[PDB]
Design a protein around this ligand. Structure first.
Ligand code: HEC
Ligand code: HEC
Lengths: 129, 129
């Protein structure tokens, strides 16, 4: 495989998510009024999350459920469904990036939330309590 | 104000570099003959590197030279030149992604090395030996 050890695959997927959470939260902060809204920065954040959302799936190689991971082994008993959720995260991220082109705020908030729903949705099922 | 703590920016940039190295190295492996060349996979790897290359600069905030980092203190004293090199990496990584559209290996190899020199060039000056 691409990764020399499972720890390399675990580290890879964790970094992809961590970089994605940093960029996603900055959009949330702008939407929730915590910091000023900047369209250019918002679209940059959208670009980042979309590109980042394409990385972590590769990290979920088989046999990487043990060790320092928050991934539940149920990911690989239902890998078909897990991949589907990840593909949806990408589609929802791609939609958010398109919305960031327009300055309709109610369109930005809802397309943002459809992504947030992906984050929470997959975590509830496949990430340790 | 994006990062609550200095440790968060250090982790952010370190993760970006890590994910870029994984994808960039797979391009070298195909170009250098370690693994077979796949045009489609090459372009995906190029896409990842181009997007990943736009992330780490944000991480180099003030006061983040202390702690568990490989960044030298000279980066901030020479921040103008450091930013220019990073923006150059972004430009070169974007150039590599454009090359992957071409089927010319002599261009693919050449554009890959212009990115490779960006990595080595900045490490020699701005990363602890
Ligand atoms: C399933 C298809 C997921 C989607 C969609 C998102 N995430 Fe997730 N995330 C998932 C797993 C299986 C894990 C565990 C990784 C491990 O091996 O530990 C995670 C982890 C995270 C983390 C923690 C990463 C770390 O620092 O160790 C974060 C911060 C995170 N995920 C954020 C995140 C966001 C912001 C998402 C939407 C924008 C998102 N994830 C989607 C599974 C899945
Ligand atoms: C400066 C302008 C850089 C360019 C261009 C590239 N890298 Fe770099 N890299 C740089 C610094 C200052 C650091 C240290 C960051 C820290 O706070 O510790 C790094 C680190 C890396 C790492 C290690 C990441 C980790 O696991 O901690 C890797 C794997 C890495 N850099 C790779 C890399 C590649 C492949 C580059 C070109 C494609 C590249 N870097 C460019 C500074 C700079």
């Amino acid at each position: 495989g691409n990764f020399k050890e499972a720890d390399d695959a675990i580290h890879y997927r964790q970094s992809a998510f961590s970089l994605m959470a940093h960029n996603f939260g900055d959009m949330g902060a702008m939407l929730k009024g915590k910091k000023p809204f900047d369209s250019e920065i918002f679209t940059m954040r959208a670009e980042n999350v979309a590109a980042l959302s394409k990385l972590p799936l590769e990290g979920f190689i088989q046999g990487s459920d043990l060790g320092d991971t928050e991934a539940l082994a149920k990911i690989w008993t239902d890998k078909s469904d897990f991949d589907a959720k990840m593909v949806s995260l990408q589609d929802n991220a791609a939609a958010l990036l398109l919305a960031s082109a327009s300055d309709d705020k109610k369109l930005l908030k809802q397309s943002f939330m459809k992504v947030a729903k992906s984050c929470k949705g997959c975590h509830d099922v496949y990430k340790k309590d």
